[PDB]
Amino acid sequence: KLPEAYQIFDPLVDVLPVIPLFFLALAFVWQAAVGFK
Amino acid sequence: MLTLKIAVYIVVGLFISLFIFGFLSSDPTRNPGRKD
Amino acid sequence: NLEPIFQLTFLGLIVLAGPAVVFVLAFRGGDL
Amino acid sequence: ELNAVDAKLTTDFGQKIDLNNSDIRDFRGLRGFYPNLASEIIKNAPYDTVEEVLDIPGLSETQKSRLEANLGSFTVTEPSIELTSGDDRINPGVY
Amino acid sequence: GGRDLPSTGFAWWSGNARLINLSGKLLGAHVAHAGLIVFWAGAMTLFEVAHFIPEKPMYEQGLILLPHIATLGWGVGPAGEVTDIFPFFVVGVLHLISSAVLGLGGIYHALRGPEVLEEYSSFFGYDWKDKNQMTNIIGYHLILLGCGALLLVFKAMFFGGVYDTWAPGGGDVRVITNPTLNPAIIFGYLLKAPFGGEGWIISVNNMEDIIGGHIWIGLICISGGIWHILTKPFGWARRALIWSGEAYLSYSLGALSLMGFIASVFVWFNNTAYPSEFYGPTGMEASQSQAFTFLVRDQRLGANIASAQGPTGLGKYLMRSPSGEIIFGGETMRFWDFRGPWLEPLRGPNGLDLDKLRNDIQPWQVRRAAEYMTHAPLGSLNSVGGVITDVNSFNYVSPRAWLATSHFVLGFFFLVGHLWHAGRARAAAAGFEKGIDRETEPTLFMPDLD
Amino acid sequence: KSQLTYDDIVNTGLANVCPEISSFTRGTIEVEPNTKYFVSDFCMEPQEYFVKEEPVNKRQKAEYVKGKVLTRQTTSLEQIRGSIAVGADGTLTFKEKDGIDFQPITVLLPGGEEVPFFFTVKNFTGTTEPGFTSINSSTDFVGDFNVPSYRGAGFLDPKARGLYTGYDNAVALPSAADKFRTNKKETPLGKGTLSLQVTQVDGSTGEIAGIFESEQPSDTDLGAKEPLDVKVRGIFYGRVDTD
Amino acid sequence: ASLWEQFCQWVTSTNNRIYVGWFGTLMIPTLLTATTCFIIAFIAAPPVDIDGIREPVAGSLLYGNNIISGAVVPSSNAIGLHFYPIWEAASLDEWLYNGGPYQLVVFHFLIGIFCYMGRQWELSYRLGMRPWICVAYSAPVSAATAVFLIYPIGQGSFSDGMPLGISGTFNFMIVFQAEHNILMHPFHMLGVAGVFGGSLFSAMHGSLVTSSLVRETTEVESQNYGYKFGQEEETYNIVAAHGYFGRLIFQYASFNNSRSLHFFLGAWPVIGIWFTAMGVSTMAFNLNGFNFNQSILDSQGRVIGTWADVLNRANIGFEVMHERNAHNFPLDLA
Amino acid sequence: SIVFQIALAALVLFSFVMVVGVPVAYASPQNWDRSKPLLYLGSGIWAILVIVVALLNFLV
Amino acid sequence: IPTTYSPEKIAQLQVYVNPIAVARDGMEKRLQGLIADQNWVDTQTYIHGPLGQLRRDMLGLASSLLPKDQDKAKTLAKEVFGHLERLDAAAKDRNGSQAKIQYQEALADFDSFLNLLPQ
Numbered sequence A: 001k002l003p004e005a006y007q008i009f010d011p012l013v014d015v016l017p018v019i020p021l022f023f024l025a026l027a028f029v030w031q032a033a034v035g036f037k
Numbered sequence B: 001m002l003t004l005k006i007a008v009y010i011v012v013g014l015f016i017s018l019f020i021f022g023f024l025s026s027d028p029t030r031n032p033g034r035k036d
Numbered sequence C: 001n002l003e004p005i006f007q008l009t010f011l012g013l014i015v016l017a018g019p020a021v022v023f024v025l026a027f028r029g030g031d032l
Numbered sequence D: 001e002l003n004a005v006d007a008k009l010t011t012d013f014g015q016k017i018d019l020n021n022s023d024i025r026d027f028r029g030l031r032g033f034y035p036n037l038a039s040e041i042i043k044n045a046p047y048d049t050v051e052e053v054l055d056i057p058g059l060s061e062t063q064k065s066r067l068e069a070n071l072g073s074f075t076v077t078e079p080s081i082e083l084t085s086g087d088d089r090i091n092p093g094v095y
Numbered sequence E: 001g002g003r004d005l006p007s008t009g010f011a012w013w014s015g016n017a018r019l020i021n022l023s024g025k026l027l028g029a030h031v032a033h034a035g036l037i038v039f040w041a042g043a044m045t046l047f048e049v050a051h052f053i054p055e056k057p058m059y060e061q062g063l064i065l066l067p068h069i070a071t072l073g074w075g076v077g078p079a080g081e082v083t084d085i086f087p088f089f090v091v092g093v094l095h096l097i098s099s100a101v102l103g104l105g106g107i108y109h110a111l112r113g114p115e116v117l118e119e120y121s122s123f124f125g126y127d128w129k130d131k132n133q134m135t136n137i138i139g140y141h142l143i144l145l146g147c148g149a150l151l152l153v154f155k156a157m158f159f160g161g162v163y164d165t166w167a168p169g170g171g172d173v174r175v176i177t178n179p180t181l182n183p184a185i186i187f188g189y190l191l192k193a194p195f196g197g198e199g200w201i202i203s204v205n206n207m208e209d210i211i212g213g214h215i216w217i218g219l220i221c222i223s224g225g226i227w228h229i230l231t232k233p234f235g236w237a238r239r240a241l242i243w244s245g246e247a248y249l250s251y252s253l254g255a256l257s258l259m260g261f262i263a264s265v266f267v268w269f270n271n272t273a274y275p276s277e278f279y280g281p282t283g284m285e286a287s288q289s290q291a292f293t294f295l296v297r298d299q300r301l302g303a304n305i306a307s308a309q310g311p312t313g314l315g316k317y318l319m320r321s322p323s324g325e326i327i328f329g330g331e332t333m334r335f336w337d338f339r340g341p342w343l344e345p346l347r348g349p350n351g352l353d354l355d356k357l358r359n360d361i362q363p364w365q366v367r368r369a370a371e372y373m374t375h376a377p378l379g380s381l382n383s384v385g386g387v388i389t390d391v392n393s394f395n396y397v398s399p400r401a402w403l404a405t406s407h408f409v410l411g412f413f414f415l416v417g418h419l420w421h422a423g424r425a426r427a428a429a430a431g432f433e434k435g436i437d438r439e440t441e442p443t444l445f446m447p448d449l450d
Numbered sequence F: 001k002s003q004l005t006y007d008d009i010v011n012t013g014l015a016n017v018c019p020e021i022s023s024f025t026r027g028t029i030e031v032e033p034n035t036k037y038f039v040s041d042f043c044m045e046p047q048e049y050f051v052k053e054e055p056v057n058k059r060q061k062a063e064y065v066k067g068k069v070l071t072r073q074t075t076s077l078e079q080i081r082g083s084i085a086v087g088a089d090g091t092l093t094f095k096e097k098d099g100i101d102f103q104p105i106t107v108l109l110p111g112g113e114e115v116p117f118f119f120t121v122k123n124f125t126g127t128t129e130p131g132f133t134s135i136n137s138s139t140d141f142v143g144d145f146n147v148p149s150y151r152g153a154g155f156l157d158p159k160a161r162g163l164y165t166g167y168d169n170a171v172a173l174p175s176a177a178d179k180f181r182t183n184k185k186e187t188p189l190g191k192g193t194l195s196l197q198v199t200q201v202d203g204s205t206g207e208i209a210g211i212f213e214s215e216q217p218s219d220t221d222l223g224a225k226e227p228l229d230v231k232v233r234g235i236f237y238g239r240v241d242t243d
Numbered sequence G: 001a002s003l004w005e006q007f008c009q010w011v012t013s014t015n016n017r018i019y020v021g022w023f024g025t026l027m028i029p030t031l032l033t034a035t036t037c038f039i040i041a042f043i044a045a046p047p048v049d050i051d052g053i054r055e056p057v058a059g060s061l062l063y064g065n066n067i068i069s070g071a072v073v074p075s076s077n078a079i080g081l082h083f084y085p086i087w088e089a090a091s092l093d094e095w096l097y098n099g100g101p102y103q104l105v106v107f108h109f110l111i112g113i114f115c116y117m118g119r120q121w122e123l124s125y126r127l128g129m130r131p132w133i134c135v136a137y138s139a140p141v142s143a144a145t146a147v148f149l150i151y152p153i154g155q156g157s158f159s160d161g162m163p164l165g166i167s168g169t170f171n172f173m174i175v176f177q178a179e180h181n182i183l184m185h186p187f188h189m190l191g192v193a194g195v196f197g198g199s200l201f202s203a204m205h206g207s208l209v210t211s212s213l214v215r216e217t218t219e220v221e222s223q224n225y226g227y228k229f230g231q232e233e234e235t236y237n238i239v240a241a242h243g244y245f246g247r248l249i250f251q252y253a254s255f256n257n258s259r260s261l262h263f264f265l266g267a268w269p270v271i272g273i274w275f276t277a278m279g280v281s282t283m284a285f286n287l288n289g290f291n292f293n294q295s296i297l298d299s300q301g302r303v304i305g306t307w308a309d310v311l312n313r314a315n316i317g318f319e320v321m322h323e324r325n326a327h328n329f330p331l332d333l334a
Numbered sequence H: 001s002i003v004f005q006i007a008l009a010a011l012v013l014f015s016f017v018m019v020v021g022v023p024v025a026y027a028s029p030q031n032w033d034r035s036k037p038l039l040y041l042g043s044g045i046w047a048i049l050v051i052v053v054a055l056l057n058f059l060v
Numbered sequence I: 001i002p003t004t005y006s007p008e009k010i011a012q013l014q015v016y017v018n019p020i021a022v023a024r025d026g027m028e029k030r031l032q033g034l035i036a037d038q039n040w041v042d043t044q045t046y047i048h049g050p051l052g053q054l055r056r057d058m059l060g061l062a063s064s065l066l067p068k069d070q071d072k073a074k075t076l077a078k079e080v081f082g083h084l085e086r087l088d089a090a091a092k093d094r095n096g097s098q099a100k101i102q103y104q105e106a107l108a109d110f111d112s113f114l115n116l117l118p119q
């Protein structure tokens, strides 16, 4: 696992990799805020 | 079999060479629109 | 335990961060 | 008309362990047989009678005693090459 | 540049097409996307490290990045046992931090930086028609890729070596001291049939060939970089190709499709650059292992596996390949081209050797065959291992399966993208990408077919 | 063969070729009167196949016809271990013990008939004449061998009929199911005759080579039809352990 | 001017009754080769030892097959993925017995269909069209490549390619389901949506256009004669079709833009077929459909069955019987 | 050792602040006079944070 | 850091000592004669076969050994493996003289390794 000093942020490393999915979603959010100009 | 192999190799090489040199022969200009 | 709780807190903060950026830009009049 | 294996199942081969036709899996019910003693018995087949299973060359005292204990479960029939060819007494395609 | 349909002619769902002529904004998009890539590398590595049980093999734990680091010789020793977990952690961290930096730069260029770069600098400003500048950028990047290939070479030679699954005494991290610079071998790999038993470049089976081919790749790429910096495209290239941003994109898409197909095949078949220690057995390896496992078991039971004929009359355990070699029987006859470090000690000049099979089989080989047979790259989409008719209690899908499937899918869709963009680039260059002009509809000036 | 590696041999067909000794070889292998010598890597490479066609007329010569092999370079016995015992009078007795001592082979005949047969040397016992105090160019081991059924008793025919597995009847035709003779499978143990003429002895290395001719039955397809007679001509090699 | 230029002008000529083109210069020879061999083999090929166990399978009409049962049989499992051209067989009889015709036909066919797709692009370019009909065609091509090339590669043998026959196709399908549970694979579900929906949308579009035809004929003659080839006037009333459909479901679910409608008609089946092609191509690497066997347990721990367990029973029944003599060991890995 | 945890949590907090602010700062030309130096400052601080963590990795 | 041999620590070394002793016996008996007979195929098969666990076993010796004898044993095992790799290289190229040289190198380094073995 993560070396011992870092297992306070194990639950953050657990969710970090899916972030680019949220970027792809954020593109559509931004386009929705601009009314899909 | 060896005669067959050589003959097929010649035939295939000629067809591939045709296709390659045709697409090298200024193919983008063979269109009904712009020729730049 | 608390691993799903902590995980969901991180996930929710992340989920808000992007839309929060977009909403702030839209409301304060930044370029979009 | 039964082919040859079904006619074998008509005989004692279908009622107990045949020392000359049974597969090695069929020795598993005899505690202490599978795999070592069972392999030894199949290797030193055929047997004219059941008792010569005790005359297997090179046998050991505990294996001897196990054979004497389980003599009752054994029979000897004529070796049918259908059950013997291809080392099917070791692996007849059953898993 | 406009940011809507009336001022760009592109809808929102094709909005990135608006960037085609905004060189600064396009650079920002590229740098931010590179940040996304590096971010995923770092985050996925950290996730895998966190979710890593270092005494359970990597391939049993859904890991695709850690095997890449292990194969490079970091954090592993003999038989691939994980010595130090810290190098995996450092690779992940470094990618995460540099990803932050790349994202910041991409955001700067995409959102505040100069819209176009051509009136700010001749060096970074580019025009898609500027054949000299396009080849300059090809040259800079070719030099960089040659540097990366030589980086692999340096790691294998002078920085601890790489994992050699073919190492005598057992697979181990070893330093490659004699890479094959011999051009005959290096470039005859490229001439081998892409079919069974030859396996065009998939068949590279020793780290010496891999490292030497990478030395050659480094030299070729660097020389091509210098060649393209100092020259402009020749007449034949100018006449055959389309010279536009979308055309260059389409060319790269074709290249990417080819590479994706090749990588899927590579991970499916090759157990040298993808050691089975980290990636698990190939399908061929698992089939051969099953045949070997039952040969060994039935031999211990007393079966004379040399002379045992199966139900069809072919040998149950051993048979001949169509070229005469002694091979495992059963359906695995199709996999007789397989070579693996656990099986080659039993292979003689004629194929499998009866004497070695009868008195050279080691307990570690038996264990390895059992392991590989039970980790055959078969599994369900919800990660239930084994043949599809098995029940739910074995949570396993081979990393080779994940990698091969994903890369075949990506290769195909990038072939589709290549077709889309090549067709569009041609039509736009000829000026009919927006439909048939009613006045000059070409078919109307064409004679009737019959 | 020669002295290369599996890398040099693979996909060449050399793996199916029985090793050969030399040309300047007319040695002899002296043998004790009554001791037995192991034979290490006995190889038989078939080269010619003939099937005795069966005329419909009667009573007329059948005329072996040359067939052509449809299976590929998968026709050779190799790595066979055996023994040679020297009789009290001087007779030489070759006994096949094991190895890769069978290959299924299919030959095509003129007329389109395909003949599978189980080419084998299994349990071959062969003898020479008495008065042999050596193995030389006149050593002719003539003997017999067994020919197991081509298909094992675990084989299933296209309607899943078999001997120790499968249906015992024609299930696709419920009202005629027991009507077919092929509902009963058999695997009779056939007999073949082999002759190994030794032609070349390298007594220092122990290698003997020679010609062979074998006569055996073909596949009956679990007794569906009568066996043809297949004659195989070829070459053989082996190493005789003198010590 | 030059002989080469004249030849180029001929091959790329839009006046040829059948366009040839540079892609055509490969398509035509390979496709004719595949066709000639296919016809000859389907009619007259001798049996092929597909499973590599010397158990030849009769595929041709002359060996007792009808049209439904006939096939060009895939090459032998003994061959695996090896290249088996005619000149690598000691005799034509050997080549036939090991299934060489299958390899010849398949390789030429695949080259031909890729060249067909290139040729579609080429002709659209010569006619000044937009270029993407070939993109739609890349869906059937992808599926064909999956079943004839990708799946055999992943499985390690051309013996596991789809046979070139009707019953052979069914056999391929049944075994594929037994080994991969393709029905429970979402990409096949998407392919089914693609084809069911494509047929739905074909019927819907055809029926709405036919319903809204402008009166130009009498009740005696075919209404088809109301359309004259090469008219610009629209032959149907799209606004009336939109009125009907937006009242059938609701207004905002109906297209009123013919361009968007036809884009949707193109895109739906094409995307579905791409997905099902990718499904077959990834099950080639044994990433199979969902496995919910024994997913539902009662409180004690006994399995409660679902329809997935019944499906698995069917799959096992198919699996244990397929290639009944080919397996020596307990797991069907290869 | 608790100083290492404190530095780690500080780096994560400042990374969150950066993730929020940076796009807004680059996407507000009007308030670019006072958000251009902050950008600089923040980046430096974030850089410093990373450095501290790295050193503390070998101190802990 | 006991830094002293004991009855119980020796038994935990034995589980790796047995395979290594068998391997060294084989290396003295069979591998030498395979090299002498100019038999490269069987040489490669032997060094990848019965030896195919040598690195694991001998590193288990090294890492589970005395604090003084840990790094020394690791280095000696590495030298043995390097000579084994050169042996494989020499056998692949049919280099008899180089093969015998590397064999003597590997055997001497193996003897040096087993020298620092208690009892």
Ligand code: CLA
Pocket: A017, A018, A019, A020, A021, E040, E047, E048, E051, E061, E062, E063, E064, E381, E383, E399, E402, E403, E406, E407, E409, E413, G271
């Ligand atoms: C090459 C890419 C790749 C590969 C081979 C893998 C492989 C794996 N991942 Mg992973 N991952 C990836 C990318 C990849 N990942 C990316 C980009 C992310 C960021 C989101 C992640 C984040 C991630 C997490 C959090 C986890 C994994 C896990 C795993 C393992 C379990 C796989 C699984 O069950 O998923 C299930 C399969 C699916 C959900 C099906 C996905 C199908 C997609 C949608 C296909 C899209 C089709 C097509 C491209 C659509 C566009 C075409 C268009 C024209 C229509 C496995 C080894 C798990 C693991 O075991 O960790 C150790 C795990 O927990 N991954």
Ligand code: CLA
Pocket: A024, A027, A028, A030, A031, C021, C022, C025, C031, C032, E001, E002, E003, E004, E011, E012, E013, E014, E015, E016, E017, E018, E019, E022, E025, E026, E028, E029, E030, E032, E033, E100, E101, E103, E104, E107, E110, E111, H018, H019, H020, H022, H023, H027
């Ligand atoms: C990798 C994905 C990617 C990238 C790098 C880009 C990049 C870009 N797009 Mg875009 N786009 C995408 C996907 C992407 N796109 C997708 C999937 C769609 C379909 C929905 C679109 C549809 C689209 C349209 C319609 C347009 C663009 C445009 C643009 C350009 C201008 C951006 C802009 O001004 O808007 C501003 C948006 C904001 C200011 C919102 C905030 C965005 C920031 C960067 C969020 C970053 C958050 C991050 C976590 C913070 C980290 C900072 C640091 C601490 C590391 C730009 C270079 C425009 C263009 O072409 O310009 C001429 C345009 O008109 N795109």
Ligand code: CLA
Pocket: E027, E031, E101, E102, E104, E105, E106, E108, E113, E114, E117, E120, E121, E124, E125
């Ligand atoms: C391929 C990526 C790329 C490219 C082509 C550019 C290009 C450009 N940038 Mg940019 N940038 C990038 C990434 C990139 N950037 C990233 C990742 C960041 C975040 C740190 C930035 C942040 C940034 C800012 C704040 C500014 C620019 C500016 C510029 C423009 C002026 C360049 C110049 O003269 O400065 C001088 C160039 C040098 C002094 C050379 C230094 C080379 C680097 C910094 C050292 C490392 C070299 C490395 C070893 C090489 C390989 C990299 C390695 C990672 C593989 C120019 C068009 C400026 C501008 O737009 O002017 C109006 C400007 O304001 N960039």
Ligand code: CLA
Pocket: B020, E138, E142, E190, E191, E220, E221, E222, E223, E224, E225, E227, E228, E231, E232, E233, E234, E237
């Ligand atoms: C990504 C890297 C890259 C890219 C994008 C380019 C791009 C280009 N190069 Mg190139 N080059 C590179 C790397 C690269 N090069 C390197 C590393 C070297 C050093 C060896 C060279 C040396 C080089 C020379 C000498 C020339 C170019 C030229 C060109 C231009 C036209 C060539 C062409 O039509 O391509 C495609 C190739 C053809 C159309 C010829 C047909 C080639 C065969 C028939 C294709 C068959 C491949 C086969 C199907 C695939 C199987 C794989 C394998 C078995 C072969 C073009 C812009 C030309 C130029 O314009 O000079 C300035 C030129 O003469 N380059």
Ligand code: CLA
Pocket: A021, E012, E013, E014, E015, E016, E017, E249, E253, E413, E414, E415, E416, E417, E418, E420, E424
């Ligand atoms: C490096 C690769 C690359 C690059 C730089 C581009 C760039 C571009 N493409 Mg292109 N394309 C590519 C690959 C690429 N493409 C591939 C592989 C395909 C085959 C599918 C295509 C097919 C394609 C079409 C049909 C079109 C473009 C178009 C464009 C232009 C605008 C596109 C846009 O705004 O995106 C906007 C982004 C979106 C609308 C979001 C799309 C989301 C996809 C469909 C699903 C994502 C699935 C993914 C796997 C994640 C799964 C999520 C899961 C968790 C549910 C732009 C210049 C347009 C064009 O021609 O401009 C002139 C256009 O019509 N491309």
Ligand SMILES: CC1=C(/C=C/C(C)=C/C=C/C(C)=C/C=C/C=C(C)/C=C/C=C(C)/C=C/C2=C(C)CCCC2(C)C)C(C)(C)CCC1
Pocket: A006, A009, A012, A013, A023, A024, A026, A027, A030, E032, E033, E035, E036, E039, E046, E093, E096, E097, E099, E100, E102, E103, E104, E106, E107, E110, H008, H011, H012, H015, H016, H019, H053
């Ligand atoms: C432009 C644009 C776009 C895009 C964007 C992008 C693409 C981006 C990005 C970006 C990126 C790419 C980023 C990033 C980041 C990173 C960060 C921010 C970091 C960090 C850090 C940290 C904090 C870490 C920590 C740690 C450590 C140190 C180790 C251990 C673990 C942990 C995790 C704790 C979009 C589409 C939206 C639209 C609009 C336009």
Ligand SMILES: CC1=C(/C=C/C(C)=C/C=C/C(C)=C/C=C/C=C(C)/C=C/C=C(C)/C=C/C2=C(C)CCCC2(C)C)C(C)(C)CCC1
Pocket: B020, B023, B024, E185, E186, E187, E189, E190, E201, E204, E209, E210, E211, E212, E213, E214, E216, E217, E240, E241
């Ligand atoms: C590293 C390595 C190696 C090596 C490798 C190498 C050495 C390579 C290479 C390679 C190369 C060197 C390549 C290439 C390529 C090419 C291509 C891919 C091409 C092409 C083409 C094209 C695309 C063209 C097109 C066209 C035509 C056809 C005509 C018209 C015009 C055009 C352009 C359209 C080895 C294996 C040893 C081992 C492993 C690792």
Ligand SMILES: CCCCCCCCCCCCO[C@@H]1O[C@H](CO)[C@@H](O[C@H]2O[C@H](CO)[C@@H](O)[C@H](O)[C@H]2O)[C@H](O)[C@H]1O
Pocket: A031, A032, A033, A034, A035, A036
């Ligand atoms: C539970 C209740 C139902 C939940 C419904 C969830 C789905 C709702 C729609 C999702 C949002 C779509 O977002 C919608 O995009 C359209 C494009 O036509 C844009 O439409 C709007 O654009 C801008 C807003 O900035 C306005 O000036 C414009 O007059 C208006 O048309 C808006 O961005 C939003 O109205």
Ligand code: OEX
Pocket: E331, G051, G077, G155, G159, G160, G175, G179, G322, G323, G326, G327, G332, G333, G334
């Ligand atoms: O070959 Mn036609 O299918 Ca593919 O899975 Mn293994 O192999 Mn056979 O057994 Mn099931």
Ligand SMILES: [Ca+2]
Pocket: A010, A011, A014, E050
């Ligand atoms: Ca965790």
Ligand SMILES: [Cl-]
Pocket: G171, G175, G321, G322, G323, G324
């Ligand atoms: Cl079947």
Ligand SMILES: [Cl-]
Pocket: E329, E330, E331, E332, G326, G327, G328, G329
């Ligand atoms: Cl099998």
